[PDB]
Paper text:
We have described herein the reactions and the structure of Pgp3, a Csd protein of C. jejuni. This enzyme turns over the cell-wall peptidoglycan by both the d,d-endopeptidase and d,d-carboxypeptidase activities, as documented by mass spectrometric characterization of the requisite reactions with synthetic cell-wall fragments. The Pgp3 monomer is structurally divided into four regions: the N-terminal domain (NTD, residues 21–95), a flexible linker (residues 96–147), the LytM domain (residues 148–259), and the C-terminal helix (residues 260–273). The Pgp3 LytM domain contains a highly conserved tetrahedral Zn2+-ion-binding motif (H168xxxD172 and HxH249).
The structures are: (i) tartrate-bound wild type (WT) (open form), (ii) citrate-bound WT (two structures, closed form), (iii) H216A mutant (open form), (iv) H216A mutant with tartrate (closed form), (v) H247A mutant (open form), (vi) H247A mutant with pentapeptide 1, Ac-l-Ala1-γ-d-Glu2-mDAP3-d-Ala4-d-Ala5 (open form), and (vii) H247A mutant with crosslinked muramyl tetra-tri peptide 2, NAM-l-Ala1-γ-d-Glu2-mDAP3-d-Ala4-mDAP3-γ-d-Glu2-Ala1-NAM (open form). The amino acids His216 and His247 are strictly conserved for Wat-1 and Wat-2 coordination in the M23 metallopeptidase family, and for the core of the catalytic machinery. We decided to mutate His216 and His247 individually to alanine in order to abrogate the binding of tartrate or citrate at the active site and impair catalysis too. In the case of the H216A variant, tartrate was sometimes observed in the closed form crystal structure; hence, only the H247A variant was pursued further. Since crystals of Pgp3 contained one or three subunits in the asymmetric unit of WT and variants (H216A and H247A, both discussed later) depending on the space group, we analyzed the oligomeric states of the WT and variant Pgp3 in solution using size-exclusion chromatography with multi-angle light scattering (SEC-MALS) experiments. The molecular masses of the WT, H216A, and H247A variants were 28.4, 28.9, and 30.0 kDa, respectively, close to the theoretical molecular mass of the Pgp3 monomer (29.4 kDa). These results indicate that the likely functional state of Pgp3, as measured herein in solution, is monomeric.
Numbering used by the authors: 20 to 281
Amino acid sequence: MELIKGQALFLELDKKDFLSLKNNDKNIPTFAHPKNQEKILAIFSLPYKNPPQNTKLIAFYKDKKEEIFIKTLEGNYKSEKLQVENKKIFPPKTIQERIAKELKEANAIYSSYTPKALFNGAFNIPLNSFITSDFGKARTFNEKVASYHSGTDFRAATGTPIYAANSGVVKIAKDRYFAGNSVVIDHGFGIYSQYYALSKIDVKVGQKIKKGELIGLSGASGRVSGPHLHFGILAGGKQVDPLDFVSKFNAIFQLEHHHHHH
Ligand SMILES: [Zn+2]
């Protein structure tokens, strides 16, 4: 199969006698296919930056193995030559420490896997606006990607209500470097939605949040590009194209429903 860098796919496997799914000694979790009881699903994501050229996954069964080849596609993201190259920044030492501390926190949060659906059917858009700057716009040096937009931006006047794109559990709700005021929601199955640059946070860590429920107010009045909501999705351990992920997720789960029981 084929996958564009920085996107996720939902891999389908036979359920009977399946034991584990691996990528070079990394284990990939599985979950039920909601519409075919004989199938299970797994989420595989390619990183946007410096991805492998090909990927071989092995599904181990009780008495056989199945190989799955994924070729990485470059896609057709918007890209611009970064003319300095130098791209090494020197934050003051106090900023460096805060960035490192928030990175260790985020890394641990994203690897704490929830093995059940916290979501409620389809994802909805977190506000009924439009994209102003989409995922994956890249800045290249000679021709390796130096940086890229790791989420998608919606137009929003400062103070616009922002709603949970799906049900789940709030894992982050605080001011972080780069992301500003941010909310991160665990939806289960290693899927997290991200809401950055907020002007107001209206939830607490560990709160159960319903789809369409208010999580804060849009902000970023003073950003490099002015007020907007930055929306992100992390799935399969990587930032992925969020609208492309939502489209793929909804095709599978949109006829399902769940209200929190725990
Ligand atoms: Zn953004």
